[PDB]
């Protein structure tokens, strides 16, 4: 499979970098180089931001479109992505090491449902008419914010981009996007379909490059109105801070978590075992929603640990293009070493290994730690790799205090047949999403986001539209 | 003056340092009293009080939704009871005409409280259609402990715009008034205790910016901070939030608000509205109409009648029945104003009245400048004083570009009888509020806030609830 | 306690019937006459409708009020009802035979919560701004429907009146009310409070009288815009048909039902026994929400029947004014003879009397039927008196078909600890309200109403506002 | 004409009676085909089929929300693929200019389908805060089996305004097109089947009013009905609904809609708008501008410019690219109109053009303008539904308000003025479901439509349409 699109994307034309520089992207499954990609910088960002400003200029074609046509263009874009679903899944797998079937049936399915879902909102973005006084007409407009910058991570490259572009374009904004340096490939392909669908030049522009260079340039730009970042807490902090330093641009942040997973005695234990396994080990464990703190009630603890080890010892690891591969390699050696060091962490600290604990190329064998306590490091640091740490609890209100004691709050899951327990837990957990008797159940129509240091604002759902619009009161006196 | 101490757990406290700052009457230039000077150790005590008041099982948490509303109505009952006392303190602290604080500043607080009293049992999440065997819904939960930082120009009302939605939504608060204007907030606490609010739901720490405010903005257990004040400090607040615990942030900041006048318009209506829109609150108001664009056909007549309005504006003792304009807040502001006046002369604008102080005394003569251009300082910097600069224009598409030329975007006003002209302008002005044939037309039910660098979220109306709640998704598999 | 209000209420003035006729109202507790009431007719109706028309006329004081003042007037009325709480409760007990404490702590509490809840909606009824084309402004108004008529039954006189008047006034309509002929007293007393709160003349008018006479004049009236009826299916059918044949006025109906009460094996039996008993015998069983069909899984059945009988054998029956009286007399002899004929029915048909079955005065003692089948009379006909029948079932899917087997669908209740059983039943029961491990849990903020033949619109919650507003599209082109 | 039979369970059926009725082209004045004549026993079978398809556990009920939407998009794709065929039949059955049915009627169907396609995964209930230990929420469930009864003036489009929201929300349907205009509905049935809607989700029974329509409105297992047609039959529908099972009812009825012209209006813009608003679809329109109030001081100049617009309006064969007005729908309407015209003279209005038919053979009526009209005349009170523009005269805004609100009708209103306050004051005072300003017939799938007072009950189009096709359930849980 050959990589067509490697340049910078602006006014629906392909540009090479002003500096002339280029950077490489590698296949984590072979460690070998894939291609060279134009490396943009502050000069390239400036150009893209101009373009998106002109395309947003009042009187521009994009602004003159009627709402329903914005939806038509997103439905066409989604049509093209379905036409080329296999290519895109494959570019994604070469760049991230993800199983091809996971790329094809998950990442791409999510991009199409998201794109279609927000095409549906485009003529349904409604403000309000407000009663005040007898002789007054007062109403509200949900106007487009303007120029929106988007900065995405390496673990769900295409999908995270789509979570932003889909509501942004639906609402009538324009965009300058920046993929992670590790994985520019799909984003760039997508830009080819954006031309082929009909989007007027300048509505979407794309500058690949590095964090402290292209990304900082966006976050600090004086004529970008709004920025949406998905990635690490560390960088999220800087992005909000550069945003406020510069022009006070609006900010959406989705960051990581140490997400709890609570198993009650009265759970259906195999559903629970099955979902905590999938929740830990999906996408090589390199996923923001990973189920990295599994609390089990004392009475079913050993039976839970046992059954989980079976699942982990039997999980096929290999070449992501093999159809039976359920786990590929980590993204690169930098993550590889990060993970194994943290396994040492728990060894060094008293946790009980039950399987794995070593490498196997860039593969790490599925690892289960038994008998984990809150103060351990694999219990407080997001591991972001195939490591399942299992803890033990006695009380319902005990487990609540313990799950809520991190600084983060992205996700939680609870497993029980008991109506009163499921709901009482769902209300008390400080989490952006609480799954009950399921894990990784995501929907285009259900909002997603963090409490606390897991982030700001929401993506997906009707709630995404609040992030891409500016509210205007018009008040008329008679 | 009865209330001077730090308010925590419905109790009055001396500063942990024992220090005290003085508050002063800008009319008499005499000192009203001394107020406890808080610092970070005081803020810690208040935040802890608000945390405890917010734990699950807490009296405040276990209250009915509708009970929260009844609590807000009883408070608004109390403010209406002590309405004259409160308006009186506010006039002492700010120099504001007593009748203005009584019929405007105080009237806003009672209706704001009443409006948000009615929202308590109407904060509604969503139930979301997904799959045949899935129940998925969203809950609008309180963010938690909420910080307010308010300015000196509308001390009690800018307070209430924050306190009122916050409580309605079930949060707790730590409030910091401006060092110049602490009294009303300290009095409001006593009414909160008399109203039956459980202790710790509201805590008030008076003191200063780089001290108490900075403590509030970077605290690790404040979840959300709401700021009204200057742009320079708003940036600092958001930076502190971004760098501490990523707390949610609302900003209401200033503006350079245009006031557009077509030859079409009711000139008598425009001249008074523009006049009241520049001079209200001694010009010290976020919504001040500091850039009056007039169509040349009616230009000179506008200047003539505005000059008359200004020459006849009664300036004097705020407590006298007929005072329309009191003294500026303090000597720092006073000098700021005269210095910007002078720059206008030095740069070529045409003085038509005022330009001077009066009895040295903190009063400034109502000042009108004609022949103003966009490059001038009196046309770009926010004066916060009784200075009305009048500009000139010819075409509508010319006026739009000139008005949107700031980095600000709080407020705009348009005067015309032409249906299409009115609506075209309402759509094109990049401002949070566009008034048509009125000015300063504010309602608890219409939201308020800035485009661009004038601010971030919204206060008042239904949109204010967005800023004091967190969206959780609960997804259940069957 | 002496009745003060006996006459017809129109333009805030008391009036004798045009005919001079009057009808008596009697105390079921005694069988004796309480007083005489002016009996209106089509002539008096016509006069009331004109009052409502003039007060709803454009430019009238009522229409000139701002929305938030409609709220104040509702808060003021609620305050009056709370001030005279015990008197209204007593008038209602005199007229219905209801326990005073039930009149005081339920009926009246529901009136005060409803008045206050809909006071909060008045300045919060919002239409929409709709995006279409570049040069078009389109928005909607939720305008007031106009003159609304309201017709209530005898079993909750004040409460059912309030359920219509609170949302109707909240949205700015005007009304003509009609109590049941059996209970006019409290409706009329309320009218005196309406004058005392400050509602403009004509906003509310009351014309007591009989169904086919005053009630038909309302349903048929060419200048009433909306009718809201609570009562019998038979009369509800006629009201809708008269409304259609006349002027096509809008219609709300809340009718009766045969409401199922489903008990699973894993239910908390004592809770389930407690609520199914209370849900049958509340208000002497004379309740639209009554649990006249109790399905039990045949593992707990006899143990359910047993404990049920203990509850029925000891529920104290006596003078509604005695503190410990939990069951008063039936509304009159006509209702009395309906129930005990219906008992006979079940005897013939093979049901097992477990207790009761006889009279004692106008009192019926708690009667429980066991071994009850779908085809029995007491399983299909609304008993509307203290008769608890108990059925038996094996499957979830069986009980689902059997409960939906009616033409009615007002309420349902479900008892189980099982998360999946609760929700499955909740989604599958064709009922306007489904309770889970509770019964008769009503809130001002939660809508109420019927599926199928149990009713049409909804009452309470935001959803009631739809029944009292008319939608207008305004579309402007530039 | 490939499709003439009864559509039930995505199959085709002959009437149980074996009877058929004729449909005829109002331009040829000849018969197009025969269509099965249904009666109650066929409506029972269709209703039955709609129930089984609606049973819990049925395919349609197990689809996820988004796939319901994907189906509606898929059907809108087919309507656009066969756009010409569908617009043609419509012109054959109605007399409508082909180009009007292609660019207006058929375009409204595709946008309506596509707008409500997007709503299927966005029908959102509420969660309600009550007590510390209570979970309370609402669900917006499908009402169940829905029946539609549509008129002959916009056959396909009035059908789609009903089918689209209903399907979106997961209902099933029994449709009945008007006996004059069955063809498009039966063609639609094929496209619903080719789109892969499960059998029974949509069922179509052609036939007559006191027959099939009455059978539908009184059916004990139809849960909800949506009716567009005349007021007199709308009353009958609601009555039958009340006598049977209290099924929910939506009514879109007629109007006598005012069109108000201020002196400060763009007169050229008002003239054409007023003209196209009276004469569209040969005047046979619920939105028709059947009462043109003009201010005295542009009055006679308005009349002058309208006459010119009328005398130059090309009447003729609907398939000629330059026809702007075809023939009336049949002889019955034809006589209605002429009989209302003559009474116009009898009562003293000033004919200014038209007032007669044209051919001896044809069903064409000359564009007819009346001046010097007054509120008491019949052409000012009764709905003409034909090419007749009566122009009235007024002085005051408060006077024009009272006069315009004086009907029992209240569907639609139009105001022409440049004055911001005049515009908005009238928009609040006019008791009408839709008030246009400086435009006419400005309809969008996103904006609701329907009557005040006797012009109807509910709304169609916009989010408000979903309210008529769902049933609200509260679920309250105690902990
Ligand atoms: N040495 C450490 O302590 C440490 C800790 C954690 C992660 N890391 C490194 O960061 C990576 C985390 O992976 P990730 O992509 O999911 O999260 P990330 O936050 O590092 O990157 C997310 C997105 O933000 C961009 N970005 C990075 N820095 C930016 C900046 N200052 N301004 C604007 N944008 C910026 C990135 O190019 C990317 O597109 C790891 O590969 C690891 O090498 C290092
Ligand atoms: N051109 C200038 O010299 C300039 C510029 C900006 C601000 N200021 C000062 O601010 C005042 C403007 O009036 P204002 O009250 O409306 O705006 P402000 O900037 O002083 O902010 C007002 C509120 O924010 C608080 N605050 C101040 N500094 C803070 C900090 N570092 N962190 C957290 N909170 C802080 C203050 O206690 C006050 O309650 C002026 O009087 C002036 O002294 C001056
Ligand atoms: N006042 C009048 O003069 C007047 C007005 C309108 C229609 N009509 C006559 O009605 C016929 C159709 O005109 P229209 O389509 O505009 O209005 P309409 O109300 O008669 O028909 C609309 C729809 O309702 C159906 N329908 C008719 N009677 C029904 C009934 N009893 N029960 C259930 N459904 C029924 C029809 O088959 C059609 O589908 C014409 O023949 C016309 O002459 C007369």
Numbering used by the authors:
A (entry chain B), C (entry chain A): 27 to 386, 390 to 507
B (entry chain D): 29 to 388, 390 to 507
D (entry chain C): 29 to 507
Task: Give the authors' words.
The ALDH1A subfamily, comprised of isoforms ALDH1A1, ALDH1A2, and ALDH1A3, regulate RA signaling important for embryogenesis and development. Following the first step of oxidation of Vitamin A (retinol) to retinaldehyde by members of the short-chain dehydrogenase/reductase superfamily of proteins, ALDH1A enzymes irreversibly convert retinaldehyde to RA—reviewed in19. Of the many ALDH isoforms, we and others have implicated the elevated expression of ALDH1A3 in mesenchymal glioma stem cells (MES GSCs) as a target for the development of novel therapeutics. The lead compound, MCI-INI-3, is a selective competitive inhibitor of human ALDH1A3 and shows poor inhibitory effect on the structurally related isoform ALDH1A1.
The three-dimensional structure of human ALDH1A3 in a complex with MCI-INI-3 was determined at a resolution of 2.8 Å. The final model contains four identical protein chains per asymmetric unit, arranged in a tetramer, a total of 257 solvent molecules and 4 inhibitor molecules. The molecule (MCI-INI-3) establishes multiple interactions with protein residues. In particular, the ester group of MCI-INI-3 pointed towards the catalytic cysteine at a distance of about 5 Å and its benzodioxole moiety established several contacts with the protein environment, including an H-bond with W189 and Van der Waals contacts with T140 and R139. The phenyl group of MCI-INI-3, which makes a π-π stacking interaction of variable quality with F308, sits close to the protein surface and appears to be rather flexible, being poorly visible in the omit electron density map. With respect to the specific selectivity that MCI-INI-3 shows for ALDH1A3, our structural data revealed that its pyrazolopyrimidine ring contacts N469 (N12-NH2 distance of about 4 Å) and its ester group interacts with T315 (O4-OH distance of about 4 Å), the two amino acids that distinguish the 1A3 isozyme active site. Such stabilizing interactions would simply be impossible in ALDH1A1 where the two structurally equivalent positions are occupied by I304 and G458, residues that cannot establish electrostatic interactions with the hydrophilic portions of the inhibitor. At this point, a complete determination of the Michaelis-Menten kinetics was performed that revealed MCI-INI-3 to be a competitive inhibitor for the aldehyde substrate, with Ki values of 0.55 ± 0.11 μM for ALDH1A3 and 78.2 μM ± 14.4 μM for ALDH1A1.
